[PDB]
Design an enzyme around this catalytic site. Structure first.
Site, PDB file in Angstrom:
ATOM      1  N   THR A  31       0.813  -1.237   0.000  1.00 43.55           N
ATOM      2  CA  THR A  31       0.000   0.000   0.000  1.00 43.55           C
ATOM      3  C   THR A  31       0.831   1.265   0.000  1.00 43.55           C
ATOM      4  O   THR A  31       1.795   1.087   0.705  1.00 43.55           O
ATOM      5  CB  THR A  31      -0.882   0.012   1.262  1.00 43.55           C
ATOM      6  OG1 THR A  31      -1.679  -1.196   1.317  1.00 43.55           O
ATOM      7  CG2 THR A  31      -1.832   1.236   1.282  1.00 43.55           C
ATOM      8  N   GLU A  81       9.828  -7.579  -2.708  1.00 41.07           N
ATOM      9  CA  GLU A  81      10.206  -6.537  -3.675  1.00 41.07           C
ATOM     10  C   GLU A  81      11.640  -6.742  -4.103  1.00 41.07           C
ATOM     11  O   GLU A  81      12.041  -6.358  -5.205  1.00 41.07           O
ATOM     12  CB  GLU A  81      10.015  -5.154  -3.042  1.00 41.07           C
ATOM     13  CG  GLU A  81       8.581  -4.677  -2.899  1.00 41.07           C
ATOM     14  CD  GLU A  81       7.958  -5.055  -1.576  1.00 41.07           C
ATOM     15  OE1 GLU A  81       6.840  -4.529  -1.289  1.00 41.07           O
ATOM     16  OE2 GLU A  81       8.464  -5.882  -0.789  1.00 41.07           O
ATOM     17  N   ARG A 136       5.782   6.901   0.089  1.00 36.02           N
ATOM     18  CA  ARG A 136       5.170   6.587   1.350  1.00 36.02           C
ATOM     19  C   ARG A 136       6.271   6.556   2.411  1.00 36.02           C
ATOM     20  O   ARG A 136       7.396   6.191   2.138  1.00 36.02           O
ATOM     21  CB  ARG A 136       4.439   5.232   1.243  1.00 36.02           C
ATOM     22  CG  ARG A 136       4.198   4.534   2.573  1.00 36.02           C
ATOM     23  CD  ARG A 136       3.686   3.098   2.405  1.00 36.02           C
ATOM     24  NE  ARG A 136       3.958   2.362   3.644  1.00 36.02           N
ATOM     25  CZ  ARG A 136       3.661   1.110   3.937  1.00 36.02           C
ATOM     26  NH1 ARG A 136       2.969   0.321   3.100  1.00 36.02           N
ATOM     27  NH2 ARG A 136       3.980   0.596   5.139  1.00 36.02           N
ATOM     28  N   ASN A 192      -4.479  -8.257   4.701  1.00 35.00           N
ATOM     29  CA  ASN A 192      -4.495  -6.841   4.989  1.00 35.00           C
ATOM     30  C   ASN A 192      -4.359  -5.938   3.779  1.00 35.00           C
ATOM     31  O   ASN A 192      -5.019  -4.863   3.667  1.00 35.00           O
ATOM     32  CB  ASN A 192      -3.414  -6.491   6.029  1.00 35.00           C
ATOM     33  CG  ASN A 192      -3.629  -5.083   6.545  1.00 35.00           C
ATOM     34  OD1 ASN A 192      -4.531  -4.868   7.337  1.00 35.00           O
ATOM     35  ND2 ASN A 192      -2.869  -4.098   6.051  1.00 35.00           N
TER      36      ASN A 192
HETATM   37  C1  LIG Z   1       0.644  -2.823   6.673  1.00 30.09           C
HETATM   38  C2  LIG Z   1       1.699  -3.191   5.566  1.00 30.09           C
HETATM   39  O1  LIG Z   1       2.498  -2.311   5.221  1.00 30.09           O
HETATM   40  C3  LIG Z   1       1.865  -5.072   4.994  1.00 30.09           C
HETATM   41  S1  LIG Z   1       0.496  -5.918   5.144  1.00 30.09           S
HETATM   42  C4  LIG Z   1       1.294  -7.285   4.347  1.00 30.09           C
HETATM   43  C5  LIG Z   1       0.124  -8.159   3.917  1.00 30.09           C
HETATM   44  C6  LIG Z   1       0.396  -9.355   4.806  1.00 30.09           C
HETATM   45  O2  LIG Z   1      -0.013 -10.779   4.525  1.00 30.09           O
HETATM   46  P1  LIG Z   1      -0.032 -12.053   5.419  1.00 30.09           P
HETATM   47  O3  LIG Z   1      -0.690 -13.222   4.796  1.00 30.09           O
HETATM   48  O4  LIG Z   1       1.338 -12.188   5.890  1.00 30.09           O
HETATM   49  O5  LIG Z   1      -0.896 -11.495   6.603  1.00 30.09           O
HETATM   50  P2  LIG Z   1      -2.532 -11.239   6.807  1.00 30.09           P
HETATM   51  O6  LIG Z   1      -2.744  -9.831   6.515  1.00 30.09           O
HETATM   52  O7  LIG Z   1      -2.910 -11.851   8.149  1.00 30.09           O
HETATM   53  O8  LIG Z   1      -3.121 -12.142   5.700  1.00 30.09           O
HETATM   54  C7  LIG Z   1       1.967  -6.770   3.327  1.00 30.09           C
HETATM   55  C8  LIG Z   1       1.953  -7.446   2.073  1.00 30.09           C
HETATM   56  N1  LIG Z   1       2.513  -5.549   3.714  1.00 30.09           N
HETATM   57  C9  LIG Z   1       3.021  -4.661   2.687  1.00 30.09           C
HETATM   58  C10 LIG Z   1       4.527  -4.751   2.588  1.00 30.09           C
HETATM   59  C11 LIG Z   1       5.167  -5.260   1.442  1.00 30.09           C
HETATM   60  N2  LIG Z   1       6.638  -5.369   1.298  1.00 30.09           N
HETATM   61  C12 LIG Z   1       7.492  -4.926   2.410  1.00 30.09           C
HETATM   62  C13 LIG Z   1       8.877  -5.006   2.335  1.00 30.09           C
HETATM   63  N3  LIG Z   1       6.925  -4.399   3.601  1.00 30.09           N
HETATM   64  C14 LIG Z   1       5.470  -4.289   3.746  1.00 30.09           C
HETATM   65  N4  LIG Z   1       5.001  -3.736   5.003  1.00 30.09           N
END
Ligand SMILES: CC(=O)c1sc(CCOP(=O)(O)OP(=O)(O)O)c(C)[n+]1Cc1cnc(C)nc1N
Ligand code: SF4
Ligand code: SF4
Ligand code: SF4
Ligand SMILES: [Ca+2]
Ligand SMILES: [Mg+2]
Ligand SMILES: [Mg+2]
Lengths: 1231, 117, 235, 58, 118
Positions: free
Chosen positions: A30, A63, A113, A995
């Site tokens: 995001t 990434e 961001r 999320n």
């Molecule tokens: C808040 C934010 O920046 C989170 S929320 C998370 C989704 C998590 O998935 P998971 O299956 O691990 O958990 P769930 O939500 O319980 O299904 C991501 C992809 N990120 C984005 C993201 C992407 N790539 C990196 C390096 N850091 C972040 N913070």
């Protein structure tokens, strides 16, 4: 040609990026996710790029993997792009140095961001882009939605011709999510500007075995610096290439740009330099003030890298006497922020006139940057000339902020209509506003803008929409602060938020509520709202939208009524046109399931237009008397910080309200009591069997099982019905299931699960329960929890323990939270939690709401979120500290045993040392030491006494979702489990990245529909569990609460007590999976996931192998044949069956085959006699040895890499053959 | 493709300094660790042997199908599939839906049947 | 007291970093590998730090793993260090923002080495340290082997007292691998300079379930900026 | 008539300490950077030293 | 026209063989998450891991590929965790070709592996 379009900045830039690229390597973050998701939708829809091909897109594991793929596709001759932001951009940095080093035409589109430091923020600033300024990418900023389209196009064209990669960036949310009516070019037009010779030369220099080269050599000091400076000529030509493409694009759009553009008075004396969306708002304010005679201006930076001073000076008026450079970032300890430093260097290099230069900081994490703030900045240059300031905050600690006067005039162009809409999530308000922007934009010549503010609350959240409509272009990159129209779509907000803040004198206010009478309205409208409605001469309108929708059949859904109110009363369109267009659209969209739904809706409009009459309020309102404050007792923290933030006033908190390191106390959620449930369970004691299953399942801790002795029930309310407790251990005790009706989220899992067919829980409307249950809950909360009566790890006894994670912002019915709440009832007082970013960090710690809390003793989970990628390593690190510090305590304890310490002290120390890794014995002996050494401040005993928070054995947990564990954090997860240390990993598998919006993860199963798996995933779920069971020394288990709470608890106990690494994977239901009967069926779905064989339950325990027994144990049974109904009862599978029935049938068949083979594998596993044995540790001792000690031949080479302080001794380097060949030769030559 | 351990592991290890140096400096630990290695390979080879003997196998398909067309995971869902946050917000999100605050489908039905009017 | 020794920059700094730390999370990368190897040797050998203990050292899967472990050891109140450079330091960037954002007394010793762009280089320059200048770490350069011992010691002492993390750096090969006769300090002299109260307060504010807090919250636009400027007094 | 300013503490960059080390007679100063930031108007230590002088305002 | 475009793509006519080469420190440790992802993708790439059971170029540091009891840097008293089984982890996918070779044991098995894997 040119096409008009109302879209957001993400979609304006994906429009161009899709056209101009052949490949895209993607990863969700995001606020950039939208760009990758649209590219995938368009590639599946059949959209072609400029080569007439569909974009080749692949989702990577992080990434870093995305940037490595982008690098390889570019090196191999394909035009490639990527979309990212913040933490994700930081992971691309290493490959950015390679992509620019190898002069490859890549283009990154980033939504700028904030970077996570004291806290994470998903909001917009330039902290991320500036962290990558030295990578050698060109950096081109867009400042509005329109510019995002245009600059995205220049960036790709310039990248192809110059061979320097480009980073195109725009502000996260403030530009990426703002919707505007803009113009876009056709793909044919974009194609026509491409430099065909440069594209051909790009293909011909690429990697290919028919004409190869070597790239990525390793270089010594002799040639590296020459090699680094060989690209200078490419970097010298990029500014001119950019400038030229700005002119060519402009010849097609009529929108002209320069490297730096100037706006404002030609003879300006005070000038701002700024970049990104702030430039629009600054321009707006300049137009206002300069017409009044103010000698002010603005230099907009478009190309930030390469930084061309001659183009900066071309934009600078010679009359400038003072200049303030604004940076949207903070580099702590630097002498200035990056743009400011670049500008200072231009003036020093020039070596002539030096016009007073100030540095200012603004907009971190999307903080408003409003006209009043711009006024302040200009006022500073004529007044105090404060340097290194901040704007948009009150910095009462270091005094760096500028005073902002919010009485400043509205600076929107003449004609602009500004509207605000207050919505309650899922009420359709946002949807109607977006449709309204589409309808108006498409049928008028007006410019249109929309921006939506969302809550961190996932369910029953508040939404506020900010819309503007104008005859002139809308440069207003800030929230509406002076509205013409304000609508409150949720009556409950009337007495809780400042809905009418800023409303213009005589503006219009429409309320949705049933308070139709003057006596009803007099009873529910706060004296403050009557005051304003009367003193500002507002056109007040009340509509009982729920009554109209119920009457016309739209079931109580108010969106169409409130939409009618906007079109009729907001003044953007005359009556007939507006009401005509509205009805026209109810045909355009809709017409889906008959003409009944189209009629349902058209009648709603008709009745609404009739009912939309002005409410006639008496004059008395002009002086309605103030009320009382039946406020509950709260905290000094809840009162001074959290309530203010919850009531949309956080912006008013000065820097002195926050801790420097970003920490928050536990337990702030205890006071929220939002009461957003529609229905809540009602207890029926006559049917209650007292199993405590309902409290075990609740995703919000809204059920409190009360166990009281009759004297504790003496001061209770009459309806505080209690039963006599069943059980031996319980007897003179009274049992009561107390519902927490204000913290309940109304999911229904508890009553769905309540064992008796004659239910002991029945869902009822909130309003029929609150007056009795609120005071009951308040009384029940003062009853002591009987944690000592039943075993803590028993089903029923677990619910007589204090839950240490309650009332979170997770969705109603969430399948993660029930699990974490019971983990806290078993270990909460001694736990450390390393949480990955994901839903669990967002419901776990979105400020100001902290759901983890302390027990009655002030003990509870120490919780932290480091990053998304490193949770296992952060947890490992906490373990390493506990290892070192508790070892230091053990060493002091051993020393004290050889001292004149008293016998009592030595006995306790000895018992502590003997059970230090045991939870029960280390607390038993540590509690004695806490007593015996109380007050001890000198020597050894004083050192031991100050370590008392280390006496009881701690329990380190690493929590995270499947996207974390199977993808980005897998490498660290696998390393930490392979470490053999005592940490516990709990994965909430939602089979998607939840999320961020439902993207496919390697945990997503075959055939499931998710973003990037929109035709059903075509690779099976990765078997994390069986991959980690190959270690032999890691405990592994799978759980599913709805199937067996018993197995869950057993797994928790077995996993935590394992003196080595543990991994537990839980089946977690999520809204993204589309449970057809509601999230209140989650427990049942968890049961079926196991009975169907889809999610089999097992435990792998290395301590059984250590005793010569098989460590693998199967806890669930053979698939029962229900898979198909399990799958079809969720939308993630059922949507596919509806749209690609051929594919869906085969994919559900595949899942059936996969689970059948995997169950049979688990069966031979449980039948094997071949098992990897176990040993927790044992050996080592003091001393080290180098691998090279006493070797017969050299063990190190002749390079700088293996050179060491003690290397360089002569040895046999294998250039003379084997020992035996050398001795043979010797025997053959002799002499 | 290879056969059962022939008994030469000890010779194998002691022919390389990375193992032999341990034996010269921590003889007791070294002889335990070399025996642990022999155990590990013994067990692993038996594991590879039942793998090679199994009839329970993961079938195979290289690919096939997909075509043009995709669908969103929330299309046609009975309840909301997105939350109320800025992170799930998308260009076409915002429509009204049942957010799971009134209980299950069956619970709302039964409740209607108990109230009416 | 003081003592003469002929050694390189890597070991002059490892000498101090071992003394001043309780935990180290490591990963090999030229020309910094010698520091981690010496610390692991010395740990295996029973050398004591200023607390009378042997260093707790573990190798991670990457420098990103190492930086996450460092962050967690600091957050849980152990004095922690790491040794890195170049590509390795770039992988620690995300956790460096967290470690400074959380005012943790971490100390990174870096052998400044070139970043891989047109070609890889293991050799010395400030491309890698300058890539981290906005993370919020304090940055302290040593320009000779003898200065490497002295500045290592200043960075550790200053990080404990200031709660701002430090990056002590010196040129890859040109200082890390040059050998000189220098003077070093015994560990008891180093221990005598520690601010014991600042150390005791670092333990007291650390993560612990007996007196917990929440760290790493997620913040909206209402409070994030204020929250970022709140550390000013510390810098 | 030549000299050198050796930077010890690069961050936080304190201009008052840099000026404390600069001779009032200096007429030309060269700031050497051991890096390359392609496209930047200058390397980091140079930019920092430019800011010290602009801010000083003399 | 069409034919000139096709002619200009002649270096694409023959099917190419994409190989990823790296040692055990890469495959077992730092690049493992990326390797696992790429294998899981189901695309036609070939990975060749040269296991020296240590990080060799840097000086002989232990990696997860180092076996029990081996002396290496960071395993100065012999490695106390066993070798990670990367081959059996990747076999859990079912759609990835996985093979192990040892030239001095069999040249013929090595050549058959290369032909089958590619
Ligand atoms: C808040 C934010 O920046 C989170 S929320 C998370 C989704 C998590 O998935 P998971 O299956 O691990 O958990 P769930 O939500 O319980 O299904 C991501 C992809 N990120 C984005 C993201 C992407 N790539 C990196 C390096 N850091 C972040 N913070
Ligand atoms: S689940 Fe039902 S029967 Fe069991 S304690 Fe709760 S209300 Fe009573
Ligand atoms: S309806 Fe849902 S949130 Fe409310 S008490 Fe029951 S399980 Fe908990
Ligand atoms: S896991 Fe799913 S149900 Fe739970 S909070 Fe996240 S989006 Fe909502
Ligand atoms: Ca454990
Ligand atoms: Mg998930
Ligand atoms: Mg190797």
């Amino acid at each position: 040609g040119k096409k008009m379009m109302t879209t957001d900045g993400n979609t304006a830039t994906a429009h161009v990026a899709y056209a101009m690229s052949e490949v895209a390597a993607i990863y969700p973050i995001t606020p950039s996710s939208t760009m990758g998701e649209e590219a995938d939708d368009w590639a599946a829809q059949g959209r072609k790029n400029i080569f007439g091909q569909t974009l080749t897109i692949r989702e990577m594991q992080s990434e870093a993997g995305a940037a490595g793929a982008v690098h390889g596709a570019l090196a191999a001759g394909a035009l490639t792009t990527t979309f990212t932001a913040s933490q994700g951009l930081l992971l691309m940095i290493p490959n950015m140095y390679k992509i620019s080093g190898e002069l490859l035409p890549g283009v990154f589109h980033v939504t700028a961001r904030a970077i996570a430091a004291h806290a994470l923020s998903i909001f917009g600033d330039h902290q991320d882009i500036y962290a990558a300024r030295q990578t050698g990418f060109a950096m081109l900023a867009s400042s509005s939605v329109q510019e995002a389209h245009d600059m995205a196009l220049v960036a790709h064209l310039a990248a192809i011709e110059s061979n320097v990669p480009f980073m195109h960036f725009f502000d996260g949310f403030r530009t990426s999510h703002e919707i505007q009516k803009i113009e876009v070019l056709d793909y044919a037009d974009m194609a026509s500007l491409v430099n065909q010779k440069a594209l051909a030369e790009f293909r011909a220099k690429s990697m290919n075995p028919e004409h190869p080269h070597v790239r990525g050599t390793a270089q010594n000091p002799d040639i590296y610096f020459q090699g680094r400076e060989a690209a200078n000529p490419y970097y010298l030509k990029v500014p001119g290439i950019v400038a030229e493409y700005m002119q060519k694009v402009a010849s097609l759009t009529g929108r002209s740009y320069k490297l730096f553009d100037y706006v404002g008075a030609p003879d300006a004396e005070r000038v701002i330099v700024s970049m990104g969306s702030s430039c629009e708002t600054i321009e707006e304010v300049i137009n206002h003030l300069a017409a009044k005679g103010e000698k002010i201006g603005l230099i907009k930076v478009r190309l930030y890298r390469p930084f061309v001073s001659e183009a900066f000076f071309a934009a600078l008026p010679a009359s400038a006497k003072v200049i303030t450079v604004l940076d949207r970032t903070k580099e702590p300890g630097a002498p200035g922020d990056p743009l400011y430093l670049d500008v200072c260097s231009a003036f020093v290099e020039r070596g002539e006139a030096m016009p007073k230069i100030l540095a200012g900081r603004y907009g971190l994490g999307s903080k408003e940057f409003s006209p009043a703030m711009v006024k302040s900045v200009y006022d500073n240059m004529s007044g105090a000339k404060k340097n290194h300031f901040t704007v948009g905050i009150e910095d009462d600690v270091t005094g760096t902020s500028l005073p902002v006067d919010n009485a400043f005039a509205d600076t929107t162009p003449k004609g602009t209509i500004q509207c605000q809409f207050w919505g309650l999530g899922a009420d359709g308000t946002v949807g109607a506003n977006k449709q309204a922007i589409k309808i108006i934009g498409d049928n008028t010549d007006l410019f249109a803008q929309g921006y939506f503010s969302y809550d961190s609350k996932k369910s029953g959240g508040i939404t506020i929409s900010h819309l503007r409509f104008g005859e002139k272009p809308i440069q207003s990159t800030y929230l509406v602060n002076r509205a013409d129209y304000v609508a409150c779509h949720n009556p409950a907000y009337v007495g809780i938020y400042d809905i009418l803040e800023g409303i213009k004198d005589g503006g219009t206010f429409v309320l949705n509520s049933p308070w139709s009478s003057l006596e009803d309205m007099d009873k529910h409208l706060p004296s403050g709202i009557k005051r304003t409605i009367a003193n500002k001469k507002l056109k007040f309108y009340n509509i009982d939208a729920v009554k109209i929708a119920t009457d016309v059949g739209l079931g109580g859904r108010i969106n169409m009524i409130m939409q009618t109110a906007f079109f009729k009363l907001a003044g953007v369109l005359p009556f007939e046109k507006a009401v005509d267009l509205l009805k026209k659209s109810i045909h355009k969209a809709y017409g889906k399931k008959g003409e009944k739904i189209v009629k349902m809706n058209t009648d709603a409009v008709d009745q609404a237009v009739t009912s939309l009459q002005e409410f006639k309020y008496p004059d008395s309102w002009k002086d309605a008397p103030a009320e009382t404050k039946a406020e509950p007792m709260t905290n000094e923290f809840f009162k001074n910080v959290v309530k203010p933030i919850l009531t949309q006033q956080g912006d008013k908190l000065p820097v002195s309200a926050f801790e420097a390191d970003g920490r928050f106390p536990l337990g702030t959620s205890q006071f929220e009591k939002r009461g957003v449930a529609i229905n809540v369970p009602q207890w029926v004691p006559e049917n209650c069997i007292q199993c405590n299953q309902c409290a075990f399942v609740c995703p919000h801790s809204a059920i409190l099982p009360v166990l009281a002795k009759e004297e504790e029930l003496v001061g209770a309310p009459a309806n505080f019905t209690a039963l006599e407790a069943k059980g031996k251990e319980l007897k003179g005790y009274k049992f009561r299931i107390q519902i927490n009706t204000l913290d309940c989220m109304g999911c229904g899992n508890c009553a769905d699960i309540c064992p008796p067919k004659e239910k002991a829980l029945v869902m009822q409307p909130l309003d029929t329960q609150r007056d009795a249950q609120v005071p009951n809950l308040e009384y029940a909360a003062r009853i002591p929890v009987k944690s000592e009566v039943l075993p803590r790890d028993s089903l029923k006894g677990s619910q007589f323990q204090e839950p240490l994670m309650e009332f979170s912002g997770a969705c109603s019915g969430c399948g993660e939270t029930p699990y974490v709440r019971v983990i806290t009832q078993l270990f909460g007082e001694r736990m450390f939690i390393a949480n990955a970013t994901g839903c669990s960090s967002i419901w776990g710690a979105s400020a100001p709401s902290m759901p983890y809390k302390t027990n009655r003793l002030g003990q509870g989970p120490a919780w932290g979120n480091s990053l998304f990628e490193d949770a296992a390593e952060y947890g490992f690190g906490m373990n390493m500290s506990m290892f070192a510090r508790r070892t230091h305590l053990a060493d002091l304890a051993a020393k004290a045993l050889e001292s004149d310490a008293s016998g009592d002290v030595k006995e306790a120390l000895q018992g502590w040392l003997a059970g230090k890794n045991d939870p029960i014995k280390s607390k038993e002996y540590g509690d004695k030491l806490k007593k015996l050494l109380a007050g001890q401040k000198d020597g050894l005993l004083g050192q031991i006494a100050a370590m008392s928070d280390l006496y009881t054995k701690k329990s380190v947990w690493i929590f995270g979702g499947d996207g974390w564990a199977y993808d980005i954090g897998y490498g660290g997860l696998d390393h930490v489990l392979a470490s053999g240390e005592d940490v516990n990993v709990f994965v909430m598998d939602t089979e998607v990245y939840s999320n961020t919006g439902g993207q496919s993860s390697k945990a997503t199963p075959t055939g499931a529909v998710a973003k990037f798996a929109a035709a059903g995933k075509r690779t099976g779920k990765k078997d994390l569990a069986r991959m980690v069971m190959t270690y032999g020394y890691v405990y592994v288990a799978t759980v599913s609460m709805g199937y067996s709470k018993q197995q869950f608890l057993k797994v928790l106990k077995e996993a935590e007590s394992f003196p080595g690494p543990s991994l537990v994977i839980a089946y977690a239901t999520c809204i993204n999976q589309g449970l057809r009967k509601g999230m209140g069926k989650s427990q049942d779905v968890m049961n079926t996931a196991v009975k169907s064989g889809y999610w089999p339950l097992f435990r792998y325990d290395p301590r059984l192998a250590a005793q010569g027994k098989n460590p693998f144990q199967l806890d669930s049974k053979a698939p029962d044949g229900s898979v198909e109904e399990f799958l079809m009862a969720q939308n993630r599978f059922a949507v596919l069956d509806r749209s690609f029935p051929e594919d869906a049938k085969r994919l559900r068949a595949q899942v059936a085959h996969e689970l059948d083979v995997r169950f049979k594998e688990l069966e031979h596993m449980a039948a094997t006699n071949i098992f990897e044995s176990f040993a927790p540790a044992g050996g080592k001792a003091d001393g080290s040895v180098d691998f090279g000690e006493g070797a017969e031949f050299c063990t190190r080479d002749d390079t700088p890499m293996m050179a060491r302080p003690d290397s360089g001794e002569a040895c046999d380097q294998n250039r003379a053959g084997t020992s035996e060949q050398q001795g043979d030769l010797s025997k053959r030559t002799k002499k």
